[PDB]
Ligand binder design. Structure first.
Ligand code: SF4
Ligand code: SF4
Ligand code: FES
Ligand code: FES
Lengths: 633, 633
């Protein structure tokens, strides 16, 4: 099973699924092989009913689409639609939160409130909204109005782009026409320009893609900002991860999907119901996280993470998962079928994300607590049906220190330099104790043995003194293999990095170091990494494409991950992707994305499927940035 | 060549392309066969980087997508993305016009103005904008603001849906949650819900598709409304169509694409430049139309239509097409390559729609006349380079009576009943002289011999006394085969229909009938057919799904045509599609779209590739509607 996942708890559940005849994502992948090489290379188009069109990567006809679309047009149009789809997910999430904040401060949803007043006022100031003499509720109404206004054209560009990057970066982007006019405007323009008989110039198409990726960045930053207002900015927390966080004698409830509007309410209402759960024979309600909504409640509340991404079905295979509470995105719809076998109650809550065979409980913010109780009573009832049944929870978990919002990182660093917190970090980049920074982001993918690329690359970079930060299921991969446990710093980190993590941790009273990898949150919380990197660029007086900072979507899957990698390139970072995106069927598109975009944004994709080679390429990119700043490397 | 096109002028140009070795759309189609059956049936998904996933229509594995997506989910998600793409095109067009109207009345674009003041005031009244005591420019600013507001959520739904359908239809749609909240909002929600791990219930997905199709309807109606304000509501005109409208001794300039913002300015500036063209040896500038922008200037100015859709390359093969002036959508990008062979100057004008190898002249409304002169001077220069070269313009053209906006149809009918214009039409539906109404819409498709389905179906329906109306390239097909020439009424029309067309035409002083088919305009002007049908429903006091009115996208191609067919079903019409959409790989999705949607909206798709059978099915649908109104049939 280690060819499927490097996670031992997942391997144990794969053996249970095999002997019980429960088909998994890995079995469905095997059944799909060999996969279509036209789609794998990007040389397929179904944008009109004259299709499907395909182009042989090599050889004879077909060489061109029926309408005359070349390989470079077809590849660029498909990639642009993936970016637009990713932007539609992250910004759908953000829009949901904007509507929740508005309802809250209009008195329409009393289960929600302004929890981080400080962040509300800072966002208002950043956006140019006056706070002096204003009621918090009125400021929040104006922030929610500004959030919603960024979805459409108006007399300003998207402010969750132009106010969150330094002016010199905005200027570079504006000079190339890359600043989005409106988030949903750009998504629709992509769908228009990529439809039949429209845009048919690869560079033009890909510039539109870069712009739409910044609409995705705006949605991510907006979702982090609004979720911090509503639910609190994360601070360092200690918890655990992997399937051993399930407890046979508790009602085990996973929150899965993306939006904390849902998750966060499940967490508080579940403790409210301890006594009812005990009344049912359970010790209590054990809320656990899957995917980004799990990361949201891990970061804010220390809720333990059960699993992530490709292995999500394995939580159900234990037999102990009484409920899986879903909102949207990244939920394998197989979970509704598996539930018939495992007893789990799978519950959808959002009207635009239903799964045939799952129970639907409409969630309304206006009725959030009651809707939550309804949902948790189904969970308790499911716990009751499994009294007497043995379960197989692998007794495998790791310790996880997390909660490293950008505010938390700056506060930690301020213990070493109170009035210039970023300076101790920059000092150690300059003296070589920190070689650079790498952000691990994005998914697992069934094509890659689960977590192998994240852990292989992260081990090489940590030994070379790279400060590693992580989000989403990249953070999930690293947490489940111990990279968020400070007890593993000696094993994993180079001496320079160890010295810095230890100095910061001691100054923070820890009696030891920060963990090897800093968990910066969910995938929208890649925006926190942008805030940190923009702050470092501003403090140094250089643009982002001069910093020794890189990103790696080492096992990417979702259209959202393609959008994140594309905005990482657009804001100026060397950006590794460890699965093949469907671009290899066009050399000119590949050359743009891996080379000539350097002359546009200064960032660039590094496509590399072999993780040791990827680590070497990421180190070379870091070291090239060091050299360009005149630093030793 | 008649297996490729039923148009004799196209056949002649196909012989010229063959002996000159110029590859055409039909050759690229042959080179693509056999096409992929997974894509043809809809059983392919590339929504994440675990893909491509496919499902065998029959047999053994693969049976399910890697994430667990079933065939019905994959088929429904692909269809929903096509609807969203279509909505993105028509509403991109509409948004462009809204911005042009705003610029015009703010003094920012003096080449544009309020030409149809009457329509401006009626649209304002329909939208609820006050006109009394207001400056036309202020009313127009408020209409343009309302147009732009319909792209995003606000305190009202999309008004270019709810104000253009009768209240009883709005109520039906609202009861099913189908009224769009914002045009670009719905497009983005589709892209979100269809991304990996999101919506996975076929009925839920398809309800979202129906709602997004009404966003496309709103974009079409908004684009017709705004283009009528700016450029005038069409009234009946007489012109010609097919390649014989090109003139060897003139500078031949085709306007191609969709938006009249461009086309309409080319038309007036070209007459301004007669003397310059004569100075170059030409008799003048001969502007001709291709595709919908050609339909826009045909309807408003009587500009002759050269060709449409699948045969658009053939205009260039004549050797006489000096320039092809493009905006966006439905332009085969092959035209940029063919131009190297034919001498034509292909000029793009919109920054989101470029074609490698074509000259780009940025068009700005603020500089429209100067930009137009620049463009037409390239055309004159191209004419000069071909002095001495023989050309081969087929001497084949038809007479075309067109210009039948809904206002023009009502005015024509008012000559028979001044204060109740729709009553003479309804009287003749009741007495059986008019069996029903059929709208032909949408594209040609290289899979169908060009125009064969439109003309075969239209001949059967006209003999059975159906009033036939047409738009877009359906109108193009029928015009090029003589269906818009009143001299062909005796040949084509049943005695009842002939009597009505003659009575209306005589009352209009024509000394003869209206033409066999009424041209209602471009594809956004399918909204004119909606206005007529909604007016008839309102006058009868019944909803649209009780009228004997059907639609046929007999040779559909573009995602826009899929969106139009889907909103035709959503507003209550039986809607034929004469090519296979990628739904046959899911019986449950097919059953929804062809049968159970009748219980939701009262409309339904009729998929039928054989045109004689399609005509029989369309007549049965009309006659079932007649029977339900208690009428003989
Ligand atoms: S848009 Fe062009 S390449 Fe794509 S399916 Fe249609 S004809 Fe083929
Ligand atoms: S979304 Fe599901 S069906 Fe589609 S490519 Fe990804 S794994 Fe395959
Ligand atoms: S031919 Fe396989 S993805 Fe289209
Ligand atoms: S397998 Fe051919 S369209 Fe994907």
């Amino acid at each position: 099973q280690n060819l499927k996942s490097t996670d031992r708890a997942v391997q144990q559940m794969l053996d249970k699924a095999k002997r019980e005849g429960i088909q998994t994502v890995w079995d469905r992948y095997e059944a799909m092989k060999p996969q279509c090489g036209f789609g794998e290379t990007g040389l397929c188009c179904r944008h009109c009913l004259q299709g499907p069109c395909r182009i042989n990567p090599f050889g004879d006809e077909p060489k061109v689409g029926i309408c005359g679309a070349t390989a470079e047009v077809i590849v660029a149009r498909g990639l642009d639609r993936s970016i637009a789809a990713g932007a539609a997910g992250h910004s759908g999430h953000a829009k949901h939160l904007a509507h929740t904040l508005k309802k809250a401060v209009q008195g329409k949803a009393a289960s929600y409130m302004i929890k981080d007043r400080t962040k509300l006022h800072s966002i208002a100031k950043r956006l140019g909204i006056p706070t002096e003499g204003q009621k918090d509720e009125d400021i929040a109404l104006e922030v929610a109005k500004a959030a919603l206004a960024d979805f459409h054209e108006k007399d300003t560009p998207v402010l969750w782009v132009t106010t969150v990057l330094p002016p010199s970066r905005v200027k570079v982007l504006s000079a190339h026409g890359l600043i989005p006019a409106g988030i949903d405007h750009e998504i629709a323009e992509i769908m228009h320009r990529t439809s039949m008989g429209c845009d048919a110039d690869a560079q033009n198409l890909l510039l539109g893609g870069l712009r739409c990726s910044l609409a995705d960045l705006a949605g991510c930053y907006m979702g982090t900002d609004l979720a911090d207002i509503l639910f609190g900015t994360p601070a360092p927390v200690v918890t655990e991860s992997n399937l051993g966080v399930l407890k046979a004698d508790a009602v085990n409830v996973a929150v899965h999907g993306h939006n904390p509007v849902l998750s966060d309410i499940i967490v508080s209402v579940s403790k409210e119901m301890e006594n009812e759960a005990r009344a049912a024979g359970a010790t209590g309600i054990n809320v656990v996280g899957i995917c980004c909504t799990g990361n949201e409640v891990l970061m804010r509340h220390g809720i333990p993470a059960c699993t992530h991404s490709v292995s999500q079905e394995m939580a159900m295979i234990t037999g102990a998962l009484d409920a899986m509470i879903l909102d949207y995105q990244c939920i394998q719809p197989s979970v509704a079928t598996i539930a018939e076998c495992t007893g789990t109650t799978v519950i959808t809550t959002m009207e635009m994300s239903k799964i045939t065979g799952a129970t639907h409980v409409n969630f309304a913010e206006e009725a959030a607590v009651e809707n939550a109780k309804q949902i948790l009573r189904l969970a308790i009832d499911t716990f009751k049906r499994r009294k007497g049944k043995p379960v197989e929870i692998p007794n495998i978990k790791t310790k996880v220190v997390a909660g490293f919002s950008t505010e938390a990182i700056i506060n930690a660093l301020s213990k070493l330099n109170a009035n210039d917190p970023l300076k101790p970090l920059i000092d150690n980049v300059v003296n070589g104790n920190i070689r650079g920074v790498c952000l691990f982001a994005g998914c697992n993918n069934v094509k890659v043995p689960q977590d192998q690329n994240f852990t292989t690359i992260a081990r090489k970079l940590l030994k070379q003194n790279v400060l590693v930060v992580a989000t989403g299921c990249g953070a999930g991969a690293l947490m489940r293999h111990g990279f968020m446990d400070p007890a593993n710093v000696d094993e994993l980190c180079g001496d320079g990095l160890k010295a810095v993590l230890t100095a910061i941790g001691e100054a923070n009273g820890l009696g030891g170091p920060l963990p090897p990898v800093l968990h910066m949150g969910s995938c929208v919380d890649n925006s926190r990494a942008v805030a940190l990197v923009a702050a470092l660029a501003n403090r140094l007086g250089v643009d982002l494409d001069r910093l020794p900072v890189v990103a790696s979507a080492a096992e990417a899957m979702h259209e959202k991950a393609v959008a994140i990698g594309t905005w990482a390139v657009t804001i100026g970072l060397p950006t590794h992707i460890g699965v093949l995106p469907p671009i290899t069927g066009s050399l000119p598109v590949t050359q743009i994305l891996t080379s000539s975009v350097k002359d546009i944004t200064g960032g660039y994709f590094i496509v590399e499927l072999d993780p040791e080679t990827a680590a070497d390429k990421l180190l070379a990119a870091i070291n090239e940035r060091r050299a360009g700043l005149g630093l030793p490397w």
